[PDB]
Enzyme design. Structure first.
Site, PDB file in Angstrom:
ATOM      1  N   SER B 203       0.834  -1.208   0.000  1.00 19.10           N
ATOM      2  CA  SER B 203       0.000   0.000   0.000  1.00 19.10           C
ATOM      3  C   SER B 203       0.871   1.261   0.000  1.00 19.10           C
ATOM      4  CB  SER B 203      -0.956  -0.009   1.200  1.00 19.10           C
ATOM      5  OG  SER B 203      -1.667   1.213   1.308  1.00 19.10           O
ATOM      6  N   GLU B 327      -8.775  -5.387  -4.756  1.00 20.22           N
ATOM      7  CA  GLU B 327      -8.098  -4.241  -4.158  1.00 20.22           C
ATOM      8  C   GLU B 327      -9.056  -3.227  -3.525  1.00 20.22           C
ATOM      9  OE1 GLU B 327      -5.068  -3.718  -3.561  1.00 20.22           O
ATOM     10  OE2 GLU B 327      -3.914  -5.094  -4.818  1.00 20.22           O
ATOM     11  N   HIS B 440      -7.489  -5.736   0.061  1.00 17.99           N
ATOM     12  CA  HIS B 440      -6.253  -4.991   0.250  1.00 17.99           C
ATOM     13  C   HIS B 440      -5.530  -5.386   1.539  1.00 17.99           C
ATOM     14  CE1 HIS B 440      -3.690  -1.712  -1.004  1.00 17.99           C
ATOM     15  NE2 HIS B 440      -3.809  -1.096   0.158  1.00 17.99           N
TER      16      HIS B 440
HETATM   17  C1  LIG Z   1      -2.150  -1.689   5.553  1.00 19.64           C
HETATM   18  C2  LIG Z   1      -3.486  -2.160   5.007  1.00 19.64           C
HETATM   19  N1  LIG Z   1      -4.506  -1.260   5.639  1.00 19.64           N
HETATM   20  C3  LIG Z   1      -4.878  -0.069   4.767  1.00 19.64           C
HETATM   21  C4  LIG Z   1      -6.379   0.286   4.659  1.00 19.64           C
HETATM   22  N2  LIG Z   1      -7.396  -0.567   5.325  1.00 19.64           N
HETATM   23  C5  LIG Z   1      -8.676   0.146   5.748  1.00 19.64           C
HETATM   24  C6  LIG Z   1      -8.487   1.131   6.912  1.00 19.64           C
HETATM   25  C7  LIG Z   1      -9.199   2.511   6.777  1.00 19.64           C
HETATM   26  N3  LIG Z   1      -9.390   3.130   5.434  1.00 19.64           N
HETATM   27  C8  LIG Z   1      -9.877   4.435   5.238  1.00 19.64           C
HETATM   28  O1  LIG Z   1      -9.993   4.873   4.064  1.00 19.64           O
HETATM   29  C9  LIG Z   1     -10.280   5.430   6.397  1.00 19.64           C
HETATM   30  O2  LIG Z   1     -11.292   6.427   6.092  1.00 19.64           O
HETATM   31  C10 LIG Z   1     -11.785   7.278   7.103  1.00 19.64           C
HETATM   32  C11 LIG Z   1     -12.709   8.304   6.799  1.00 19.64           C
HETATM   33  C12 LIG Z   1     -13.232   9.182   7.813  1.00 19.64           C
HETATM   34  C13 LIG Z   1     -12.860   9.078   9.162  1.00 19.64           C
HETATM   35  C14 LIG Z   1     -13.426   9.997  10.221  1.00 19.64           C
HETATM   36  C15 LIG Z   1     -12.671  11.036  10.808  1.00 19.64           C
HETATM   37  C16 LIG Z   1     -13.209  11.887  11.805  1.00 19.64           C
HETATM   38  C17 LIG Z   1     -14.534  11.706  12.240  1.00 19.64           C
HETATM   39  C18 LIG Z   1     -15.306  10.674  11.672  1.00 19.64           C
HETATM   40  C19 LIG Z   1     -14.752   9.833  10.678  1.00 19.64           C
HETATM   41  C20 LIG Z   1     -11.939   8.039   9.446  1.00 19.64           C
HETATM   42  C21 LIG Z   1     -11.405   7.156   8.454  1.00 19.64           C
HETATM   43  C22 LIG Z   1      -9.025   2.263   4.317  1.00 19.64           C
HETATM   44  C23 LIG Z   1      -9.353   0.786   4.524  1.00 19.64           C
HETATM   45  C24 LIG Z   1      -6.847  -1.389   6.442  1.00 19.64           C
HETATM   46  C25 LIG Z   1      -5.544  -2.091   6.244  1.00 19.64           C
END
Ligand SMILES: CCN1CCN(C2CCN(C(=O)COc3ccc(-c4ccccc4)cc3)CC2)CC1
Ligand SMILES: CCN1CCN(C2CCN(C(=O)COc3ccc(-c4ccccc4)cc3)CC2)CC1
Lengths: 533, 535
Positions: B203, B327, B440
């Protein structure tokens, strides 16, 4: 003196001729006038009904071909000559032909009316591939075909003017339709069961009769083979029609009245000589003089009319050949020829697309190239050549057909769709063209039943199937045998299932979606691309 | 000393370390965890490039993982393995620039090839101490030396006021580089070969690796590279200086703050204050978008990655790249209405159109429709299952698969030896719903060999599968060829070329060679759409 060969139509008496078909005789009535010759003052004018005649009119031979451009790309080549005029050319050409079984039908018979094609600039009902003797003999049908004015004589228009209102070529067709209503009963035909069928410009014509209310009372069923009223080539606007007429006039030495006067005083060939030099772009599958959106014959654009039309009690049969575009490539696209394998570069491919899609902006053209490229083999000349054919075929026929079929099915019409995938063993065009535009016709008209034409014995069996489909559709609005079981059945085309069949040597096979993703590109996306630009 | 294990005592440029003897399924390994490689980037050093760690006195205890760099923590699914396994497993702090070292026990005779792991996490999260990055299996079974470093993320790692002194940007990448420099100087003390260093990451980690390829000062710190499900090119891995400057200035305002005066005020803010606000500066409602990422500063990155990959020379480069089968699925449940891990996520066509605008946030109405029309199944345009799987593919293709496809294409064409793969096996232990397929980041546990741990309840086939991949990765690090020379019986993994576009499937079944990675679809994303945003 054979009373079978003698008929009284409203205009007087006719003498037909008894013709030999493989399975028996048929009564043919060729060269019947349905209109006053559109000559001199009647040039560019709506046709007038034929004046009655004395005695017995000789209807035993094909009449003249409407004055038209004659192809010259391959002089003497059978593949081109089979479409060229086979009778003397003349503005005096408005005659129709009729085949019936022999004896005349006891009971009233379904009527098939053929409207030929040729880009609205060429064609004739006397070509051998339109021979209606086989259908009349085998299926006991009554076949009819008319000549109609092509080129400037049929579709040159100064819209709004009295002496060149446009669409007279279509009105020629309409009058012949009126003749069938008024007279075909005397031939044993049933005027309440009339099926229009045509190919290319002919299919588009059939489509325009579907979209013009006065024509609707003259038939009951339709068949559009490789052509549509919608699409990029079948119609022009009033503004564009007015432009080309005035340019052609200029090109020959000429107030609408006064401009049309000078044109009326020009030999037929002087007009044809400048016919092709009024096109706004270098292009293929583009035709200088074609039907016009006049607000009369066509109250609106075909697209508009098919989008908002009620087709509740309509039955239609539509389809395409496997290679709709190949034929047109050797008539303008550099790199292509009937005499080599036309293997092209990627560069030639980009150039040809500007010719195949003369309307396209640079972005739009590139969108086409990127869509049709085989990115696994982006340089392979075979793919590029085969792809150039598809661009033309899909842009001009397949997706216009797919769109129409979709709109009709959706708005209450009964629709059956086919794809024709058999290449005639007798074909003289090269193999890379595959199954070119127009070469389903000889099979529908059943020419393979003529043993002298050296068709394979399997093709004769194939031709009989297709004649059955067409005539069953004519009788009932359903090409399926009302006597046959497993096959399987030819299902109606619908917007949901989108099922169509394949016509070839092998049994019917039902497929789904007619180049759906590619037609989504042509019919949904590219318009948005020149609606924003 | 006197009574310590003589294999667990090692000296490095900054002092002495006491490692720890760890148990792996097949035997012991030596772990040196929590080695400081930088001065704590705290106080007046917040947002600043890393200074090398000043030498210490005595024997630094290196037996446990150190602090995780300060970062946002996922709260979407509390107490759920699918999320917890990625969350910080140590204390959060700005004092977090430490690295870890695994070696065979006892350390090897001849110098052994070195693998350096760079964790992902959208440049806003991650840690080298996560269970899934455990280097004990690679070390024990393949005799490799495995290094992993912490690097600053979020604002602390990538907030930039380009051109400024106190916030030059990309300091997160400079942490990584400093750790690479540390390896060049000190890894020999552990038996590692500094002449054979292979970077690998996933990533934002894969992107990071690509940035080290494209940044000259980093090229002399490694010899080979692996990019898993990520690239430096693409829509999320970088931002312009102008954009970074805006995002930084906005964040300042959101917490109450001349560049000097502004940065100074930011440095007075509690670390949690910054994390609480960093997500609120994204130009759109979006998924697979992160506020603070590497900036094109014309320094670390002399130009855009797209530019540098298009013009650079990569003859002397050997690289292994690939993707997982699904992905995009992971990202849908984090901001596309209609999606959840607790239902089948069957969506409507309307939700698909709406999702496209979120997954392709920089798109016009025309560009968006082009996406929708390209991804529509016209035989079943209303089928919710196809619309659901299409939404995943749009996000997957746009952000990973086609950037990776472009990267492999350019590199191969410009001298690089490229190996390409798609990873298609869903872990039997996966707790995400089946409709997500292979999401992913779920190839990683197999590369690091976790299935070899009987207590994790993997299948035996997965255990053999894991060992097979560990061989591919270490063989590549060892030779620049994932294939086993000894074994020609097995199918070979051919280099990806522009001509044939070969790549391999990675699953329980033997290697299968395929051709073209989303060739048609990636032509849409990489050739057409750019020239549509040029209008
Ligand atoms: C190394 C591999 N990883 C990478 C990505 N994987 C997940 C984790 C979180 N992801 C996000 O796009 C977060 O989005 C957000 C959007 C908004 C908020 C938010 C902020 C403040 C208040 C409310 C919500 C938090 C996260 C991607 C998918 C997990 C494993
Ligand atoms: C009913 C089925 N038909 C329809 C179409 N088929 C062929 C014939 C001619 N075609 C053209 O596009 C003509 O183009 C041109 C372009 C330019 C000129 C020209 C004019 C003046 C001077 C020199 C050339 C002539 C024809 C399409 C493919 C034959 C079978």
């Amino acid at each position: 003196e054979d009373p079978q060969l003698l008929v009284r139509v409203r205009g007087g008496q006719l003498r037909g001729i008894r013709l030999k078909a493989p399975g028996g005789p048929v009564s043919a009535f060729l060269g019947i006038p349905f209109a006053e010759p559109p000559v001199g003052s009647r040039r560019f004018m709506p046709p007038e009904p034929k004046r009655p005649w004395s005695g017995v009119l000789d209807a035993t031979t094909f009449q003249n071909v409407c004055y038209q451009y004659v192809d010259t790309l391959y002089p003497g080549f059978e593949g081109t000559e089979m479409w060229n005029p086979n009778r003397e050319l003349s503005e005096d050409c408005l005659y129709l032909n009729v085949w019936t079984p022999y004896p005349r039908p006891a009971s009233p018979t379904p009527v098939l009316i053929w409207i030929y094609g040729g880009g609205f600039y060429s064609g004739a009902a006397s070509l051998d591939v339109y021979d209606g003797r086989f259908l009349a003999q085998v299926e006991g049908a009554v076949l009819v075909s008319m000549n109609y004015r092509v080129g400037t004589f049929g579709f040159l228009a100064l819209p709004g003017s009295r002496e060149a209102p446009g669409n007279v070529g279509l009105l020629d067709q309409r009058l012949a339709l009126q003749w069938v209503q008024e007279n075909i009963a005397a031939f044993g035909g049933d005027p309440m069961s009339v099926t229009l069928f045509g190919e290319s410009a002919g299919a588009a014509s059939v489509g325009m009769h579907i979209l013009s209310l006065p024509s609707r009372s003259l038939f009951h069923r339709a068949v559009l083979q490789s052509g549509t009223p919608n699409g990029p080539w079948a119609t022009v606007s009033a503004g564009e029609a007015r432009r080309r007429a005035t340019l052609l006039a200029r090109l020959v030495g000429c107030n609408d009245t006064e401009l049309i006067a000078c044109l009326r005083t020009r030999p037929a060939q002087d007009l044809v000589d400048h016919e092709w030099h009024v096109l706004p772009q270098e292009s293929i599958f583009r035709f200088s003089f074609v039907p016009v959106v006049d607000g009369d014959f066509l109250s609106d654009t075909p697209e508009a009319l098919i989008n908002t039309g009620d087709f509740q009690d309509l039955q239609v049969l539509v389809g395409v050949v496997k290679d709709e575009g190949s034929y047109f490539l050797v008539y303008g696209v550099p790199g292509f020829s009937k005499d080599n394998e036309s293997l092209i570069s990627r560069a030639q491919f980009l150039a040809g697309v500007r010719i195949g899609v003369p309307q396209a902006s640079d972005l739009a053209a590139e969108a086409v190239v990127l869509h049709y490229t085989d990115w696994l083999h982006p340089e392979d000349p075979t793919h590029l050549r085969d792809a150039m054919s598809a661009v033309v075929g899909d842009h001009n026929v397949v997706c216009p057909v797919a769109q129409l079929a979709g709109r009709l099915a959706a708005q209450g019409a009964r629709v059956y769709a086919y794809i024709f995938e058999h290449r005639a063993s007798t074909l003289t065009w090269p193999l890379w063209m595959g199954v070119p535009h127009g070469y389903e016709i000889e099979f529908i008209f059943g020419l393979p039943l003529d043993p002298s034409l050296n068709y394979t014995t399997e093709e004769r069996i194939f031709a009989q199937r297709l004649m059955k489909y067409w005539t069953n559709f004519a009788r009932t609005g359903d090409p399926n045998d009302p006597r046959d079981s497993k096959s399987p059945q030819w299902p109606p085309y619908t917007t949901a299932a989108q099922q169509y069949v394949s016509l070839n040597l092998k049994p019917l096979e039902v497929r789904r979606g007619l180049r759906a993703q590619t037609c989504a590109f042509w019919n949904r996306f590219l318009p948005k691309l020149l609606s924003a630009t």
